[PDB]
């Protein structure tokens with residue numbers, strides 16, 4: 001019953017091309033991480 | 049009535065149930081229900097042991 | 098009385114939203130994933146609270162829909178609060194071929210495990226090879242280089258359909274995969290034996306499928 | 310069960326739209342009267358609601374709200390382009406004191422285009438368009454097109470509000486501070502912003 | 508069997524501490540001093556050195572205890588000074604082995620008050636070496652410097 005039903009459809013798709021719909025919610029935009037920059041200060045002090 | 053039949057025609061599930069006549073599809077569905085019931089019985093028997 | 102859940106929400110709906118499976122499933126459903134019988138946890142959860150989830154998502158102007166084959170998915174309306182997108186025609190070729198594979202009893206002996214090569218061979222068997230080649234590259238005339246390009250595009254689309262939940266790769270082998278019942282939505286244009294154009298118009302009116 | 314106030318909050322008619330905007334990464338400022346008031350009222354519960362997604366709901370010290378995903382985020386993440394942060398830091402610079410007298414809060418695309426071209430170094434500009442480019446008209450046209458594109462992206466983030474007409478003139482919101490520099494006791498904002506832009 | 512013990516705790520370049528080492532007791536160790544002296548800070552340094560998972564660490568005030576707040580700031584950054592910082596523990600194993608665990612902490616430049624952590628471990632260190640001296644270089648006339 002379906003062999004003909006579906007096979008002809010594939011054969012002749014491009015005479016009536018159609019497309020399905022899907023949910024495509026947006027992605028969460030985030031900041032691009034810049035190269036990590038630490039604080040360097042060569043601290044000194046009197047030792048207890 | 050034609051609209052009701054057209055509505056139901058699309059709602060058939062898979063190949064073995066593709067009797068395009070809905071009323072004829074009912075009994076095939078119920079045959080599946082019986083088959084499923086037997087499988088369930090065997091599986092629960094296995095689970096007990 | 099006041100300060101009582103029932104004032105603002107049905108108890109069953111609040112009970113569903115408080116479940117530990119909800120966040121994963123909501124994130125995936127909004128992403129377009131289809132839910133079949135195999136992932137029991139999610140499918141059973143959907144069955145338990147179906148009406149509550151349908152009424153909830155209705156607030157966004159989207160229908161939570163259940164196909165007769167038993168798989169759930171989201172279909173946005175025209176006034177949808179959530180964006181909507183359409184698949185490519187190559188995606189359709191591979192999808193219909195995956196469906197035909199699922200039905201085929203001659204290959205039932207594979208026990209569900211298929212290889213990309215077999216899929217490619219079936220596709221080329223039914224479609225017009227060279228004229229379908231027109232979409233891969235405008236200058237293709239059967240060259241093996243262009244054949245490899247077609248194979249790689251097929252591989253990529255198959256991966257994308259994996260993300261949609263239409264197919265599962267094996268745990269250790271990425272060259273072999275197993276089908277799921279969600280593929281049957283590719284047959285929506287032929288499952289009823291009637292005039293194709295009226296079927297097409299009904300689908301487009303229902304929001305299932307757009308033209309190109 | 311579920312906390313009563315959380316159920317009340319998410320039962321509100323404003324929630325679905327705000328949820329859709331937040332998951333897209335939009336920032337809610339003091340401009341959006343109703344949304345901002347809603348967040349102010351139900352923050353204590355919305356923070357818990359979004360923690361279930363491994364995503365953080367933060368209120369910036371300036372006053373605007375936004376979401377920050379963790380590494381284990383349940384919402385699919387996406388990341389801005391280099392040119393995007395360049396433009397963002399430029400807008401942060403334009404949120405200046407003489408701005409009030411210069412433009413009364415309403416800028417034009419050309420202000421930003423010329424500021425970007427004047428303040429940035431040529432090498433990173435070429436890296437933005439394409440390394441093969443060299444000081445040519447078509448490259449500048451492409452850079453203008455890219456500037457308009459990224460500006461629209463930022464408008465989707467809520468950073469910049471276009472005035473309602475087809476022409477490209479806009480106003481800068483306080484939430485642009487997210488691009489800004491670290492502030493230390495007594496430091497001049499102009500200098501530190503320029504120091505990072507360099 | 509002889510159970511293991513914590514010998515000491517060391518802090519370097521914390522808020523108010525340049526290089527200080529507390530010698531713990533076998534049973535009980537007490538910290539006293541007026542408000543704002545730095546007791547809770549010492550607690551925080553210890554626990555940070557024990558579980559460096561930055562997702563978990565959250566130092567609320569003693570008031571507001573038990574309130575799940577999601578505060579904008581976890582409260583660790585302000586307890587550190589600019590430059591490099593350390594927090595280390597000396598432990599005597601049941602096998603009578605001396606092992607020094609710890610972490611290197613450092614503020615992140617940028618508007619967000621973020622922090623960087625890098626754990627480390629030392630085994631076999633001679634008993635005569637003190638962590639305070641091991642982590643610093645004597646530059647100038649008794650004016651030591653910390654080293655990365």
Ligand SMILES: Nc1ncnc2c1ncn2[C@@H]1O[C@H](COP(=O)(O)OP(=O)(O)OP(=O)(O)O)[C@@H](O)[C@H]1O
Nearest residue numbers: 541542543544545546547548549582583584585586
């Ligand atoms: N995150 C921070 N940022 C800035 N200053 C801080 C921070 N945490 C602590 N301080 C300051 O460091 C000093 C030490 O605080 P701490 O809580 O450690 O002291 P304490 O002796 O334990 O006090 P108390 O017994 O009253 O809790 C106090 O001045 C406190 O204000």
Ligand SMILES: [Mg+2]
Nearest residue numbers: 543546547548
């Ligand atoms: Mg204290």
